[PDB]
């Protein structure tokens, strides 16, 4: 008996300045009882539009909504950097007030190749005192996303002792950043001298190595 809201597609890529069209379907007719929310990671959901077509106060006029019955549409006339986000519809018509699963609008970046700036951070003295050594390699503001980090300790390729994470794409220049951490026990850390982060990326003609010598 509950009204199911569905959305298509579940994600899409689009370029800044383009017109964007995303749709929301109700499993039953609900007249104009549809809302749109914008969701960005870690941020409060934001009401954009209610009763299908009424802009919430302060929402830019490039946003508009249309539809009736079981088919509804959110339109952005000229996509802006702040518009990359997840959009969810919601019916207030009946019963359990249900939301669509959300459509994520992502960048179709036509962006220049940009090699990462590569930086390396030895363990802090406070961490070493606790018996562990984390070495951090930072790849800053690169495009495209594919980047390979290899850790080398006295030129021996490491495996299994590192983790990495990449940021969300930057909506203003399409770049990514990547943090890789190599973690050793302090005892193991002190058995070696050269700690190196070796980076492969389309923007580099050969791998770049960033290194330090322990305690120098």
């Amino acid at each position: 008996g509950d009204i199911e809201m569905t959305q298509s597609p579940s994600s899409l890529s689009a370029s800044i300045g383009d017109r964007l069209t995303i749709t929301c379907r109700a499993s039953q007719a609900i007249r104009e009882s549809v809302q749109w929310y914008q969701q960005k990671p870690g941020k409060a959901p934001k009401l954009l539009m209610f009763s299908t077509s009424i802009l919430e106060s302060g929402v830019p006029s490039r946003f508009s909504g249309s539809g009736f019955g079981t088919h509804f549409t959110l339109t952005i006339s000229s996509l802006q950097p702040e518009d990359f986000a997840t959009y969810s519809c919601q019916q207030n018509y009946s019963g359990p007030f249900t939301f669509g699963p959300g459509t994520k609008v992502e960048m179709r970046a036509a962006a220049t190749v940009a090699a990462p700036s590569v930086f390396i951070f030895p363990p802090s003295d406070e961490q070493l005192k606790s018996g562990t050594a984390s070495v951090v390699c930072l790849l800053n503001n690169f495009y495209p996303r594919e980047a390979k980090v290899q850790w080398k300790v006295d030129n021996a390729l490491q495996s299994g002792n590192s983790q990495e994470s990449v940021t969300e794409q930057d909506s203003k220049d399409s770049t990514y950043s990547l943090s890789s951490t190599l973690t050793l026990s302090k005892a193991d850390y002190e058995k070696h001298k050269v700690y190196a982060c070796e980076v492969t990326h389309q923007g580099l003609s050969s791998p770049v190595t960033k290194s330090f010598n322990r305690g120098e």
């Binding site: 409060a44 959901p45 934001k46 009401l47 207030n92 959300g102 030895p122 950043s177 951490t181």
Partner: protein, 222 residues
């Protein structure tokens, strides 16, 4: 005052356990509005959980939580509450406090949410250690210097990081958490600043791990 909703209380709970969430409202006359709790579980969309009338004279519940959850409000202290009992795996979610615009069951102001983690696994609540990532000759190029904080070995999620109490936002990258083989999370947050600035400016990373009541302000020096 501007309209603000701030949820709190989320953290680790064992299946069958209990947890109470709170939502502090300000910037509007709280007692005039109906209020809702909405949640978002991993792999699911937003889900209406419960609502309460402005006078608290009526309260309704989603079928999945009825008889386990209780919504209530304090119209004098301007707070909304959600008491959860007999918690289940599928109650793991970010929980949002939201204001009903006109009583029409859609919501114009939301909080940023509080994360409830139901776990029968082995990891227990642990606050992070915060270590500096000091700027050096190995983290500078082209007149700019990278520095940061390593936020290691915490559970459950989440950690938030600001810089200089939120006054430093440009050039900040706070990375998504990674899951360690220990079952604990780690993350790092970095910022790029002028190399010329390092002698006069102070850079403090403000780390909040609310599930363990851990709050650390780490000054990062060259």
């Amino acid at each position: 005052g501007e309209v603000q909703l701030v949820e709190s209380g989320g953290g680790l709970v064992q299946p069958g356990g209990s947890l109470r969430l709170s939502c502090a409202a300000s910037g509007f006359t709280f007692s005039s509005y109906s209020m809702t709790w909405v949640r978002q579980a991993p792999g699911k969309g937003l889900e209406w959980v419960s609502n309460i009338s402005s006078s608290s004279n009526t309260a309704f519940y989603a079928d999945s939580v009825k008889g386990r959850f209780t919504i209530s409000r304090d119209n004098v202290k301007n707070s909304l509450y959600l008491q959860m009992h007999s918690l289940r795996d599928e109650d793991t979610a970010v929980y949002f406090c939201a204001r009903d615009r006109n009583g029409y069951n859609f919501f114009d102001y939301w909080g940023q949410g509080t994360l409830v983690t139901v776990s029968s696994g082995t990891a227990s609540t642990k606050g992070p250690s915060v270590f500096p990532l000091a700027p050096s000759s190995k983290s500078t190029s082209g007149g700019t210097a990278a520095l940061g904080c390593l936020v290691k070995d915490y559970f459950p999620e989440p950690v938030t990081v600001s810089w200089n109490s939120g006054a430093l936002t440009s050039g900040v990258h706070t990375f998504p958490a990674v899951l360690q083989s220990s079952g604990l999370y780690s993350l790092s947050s970095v910022v790029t600043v002028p190399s010329s600035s390092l002698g006069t400016q102070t850079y403090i990373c403000n780390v909040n791990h609310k599930p363990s009541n851990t709050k650390v302000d780490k000054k990062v020096e060259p």
